[PDB]
Structure formats: structure tokens, C-alpha cells
């Protein structure tokens, strides 16, 4: 792709902002989770530190392409999901917080970042390669915890999914056209996110009917 074209740079201004904002919010989210889960405080602080590194990497990706990120756009993009995390944290709802960041958001990021890698400029490709591998660890942390605590967490997981999965589906739709400009096909993003999230839900303990119901709250939101 022509990384120096005005159409590419325009789309990149919003995409770069979105990823910078997402990493920043993930840093705050894992730091908040560290307070909520004393037994895993050290591990969660380590995950937060990785997010800070990711944020700085993506800031450099924008600099490399001479793109100024549209942070106002990115704030608004995350706002509804972010405020839901904040409310859950205030309520001491650790399960909801874990689902939002560790599973929903990390799965969205894994799906999107892996689709970006083969169309990314060489500088951004190497950065993204390093970021996605941390994302596997983040998702794995959430899966391990929720699986180990499945019975106690299940009802809240269902409630949290119903409220928050539609928000990420709306985000997926909002980003689709800019992502297409960057060479990332919407069909791939949708499939890969649905597969990743569905598999995560199966891995933690949900049945086929439960996975379909949970996934449908997202798909039906469009
Ligand atoms: C600037 C280069 C990265 C471009 C990748 C394409 C991204 C397009 C989809 C937008 C969704 C990004 C979600 C980011 C959330 C990050 C959360 C986390 O790090 O745990
Ligand atoms: Fe990250
Ligand atoms: Fe992460």
C-alpha cells in the first residue's frame, strides 16, 4: 500500500489514535484490576507495564508515518465501554472488569492486530508483532482466572457479556471503513473476532448453546 497517500494517512490518523487510546486504557484497567485482585497483584502490574510499552510503540508508528493521531475520535470510540469498566470497578465487580479487558478487548485486539500485520509498513509490522504476542498472555491470564473461578463467576459473566459485547461490535462497525483503507478486510475482522471470543468462552466453560446466545448479543447489535 501507499503509506504516504493522503487517504491512507487520514485513515491512519484515526486508527493510530484508537490503538494508542486502547493501550492507555488497558494500562489503567490492569492497574485497577491489580487493586481488585491482591493475590494476582504482581502479575497484573506486569500486564499493565506491557500495555505502557505497547502504547509507546504505537505512538512511534504514527511518528514514523508523519501522522498526528486524532485522539478526540479515539476517546469517543472507547467511551461507552470504558465507562462500563469504570462503573464495574467502582462496584467491586472484578468478573465484569476481567471480561471487558482480558477477554473482549484482548480478543478484539488479537484479531485486528493479526490482520494488520501482513499489510503494515515494515516499522509498524515489527512493533505489532511484538505487541500481539503479549496480547496472547493477557487473554490467557483472563481465561485461566475465569476458568478456575467459573462457577462463582458465571452469572456475572453472562450479564457482563450481554451489556458489553454489543459495544465492541459497534466499535468493529465504526472502524471498518478506515481499516479497509489500511488493507484490513471487515469480513476477516468479524470472523476472526467471533472465532477468538467464541473459543475463549468455550475454554472457560460455556456450552454450545451458551456460546451462541452470548455471541448473538454482539452480532444482533449491528
Ligand atoms: C497503529 C497500528 C495498529 C493498527 C492495528 C489495526 C487496529 C484496527 C482495529 C481497532 C481496534 C484496536 C483495539 C486496541 C485495544 C488494545 C487493548 C490492549 O492492548 O489490551
Ligand atoms: Fe496491549
Ligand atoms: Fe493487552
Author numbering: 10 to 231
Task: List sentences quoted exactly from the publication behind this structure.
Cyanobacterial aldehyde-deformylating oxygenase (cADO), which catalyzes the conversion of Cn fatty aldehyde to its corresponding Cn-1 alk(a/e)ne, is a key enzyme in that pathway. Cyanobacterial aldehyde-deformylating oxygenase (cADO) belongs to the superfamily of ferritin-like di-iron proteins and contains a di-iron center. To gain insights into the reaction catalyzed by cADO, we determined structures of wild type ADO from Synechococcus elongates PCC7942 (Se) with different treatment (WT0, no treatment; WT1, co-crystallized with iron; WT-HP, soaked in H2O2), and solved the structures of two SeADO mutants (Y122F and F86YF87Y). SeADO belongs to the di-iron protein family, with conserved sequence of two EX28-29EX2H motifs, in which six conservative amino acids from four helices (Glu32 from helix H1, Glu115 from helix H4, Glu60 & His63 from helix H2, and Glu144 & His147 from helix H5) act as metal ligands.
To explore the effects of H2O2 on ADO activity, a crystal of wild type SeADO was soaked in H2O2, and its structure (WT-HP) was solved. No electron density was visible for the H2O2, probably due to its unstable nature. In our WT-HP structure, a long-chain fatty acid molecule with a bifurcated head-group configuration fits the electron density well. In the WT-HP structure, the helix conformation of H5 was restored, and the two coordinating residues His63 and His147 approach the active site and ligate the Fe1 and Fe2 atoms, respectively. The water molecule that bridges the two iron atoms in the F86YF87Y structure moves towards Fe1 and is not coordinated with Fe2 in the WT-HP structure. The two iron ions are bridged by one carboxylate ligand E60, the Lox ligand and an oxo group. Furthermore, the coordination mode of two iron atoms in WT-HP structure shows a similar pattern to that observed for the R2 protein of ribonucleotide reductase (RNR-R2), in which the oxo bridge and the coordinated water exist at the di-iron site in the oxidized structure, while both are absent in the reduced structure. We proposed that the Lox ligand is likely to be the analog of the possible intermediate product hemiacetal, thus the WT-HP structure may represent the intermediate state in reaction of cADO, following the entering of dioxygen and its reaction with the substrate.
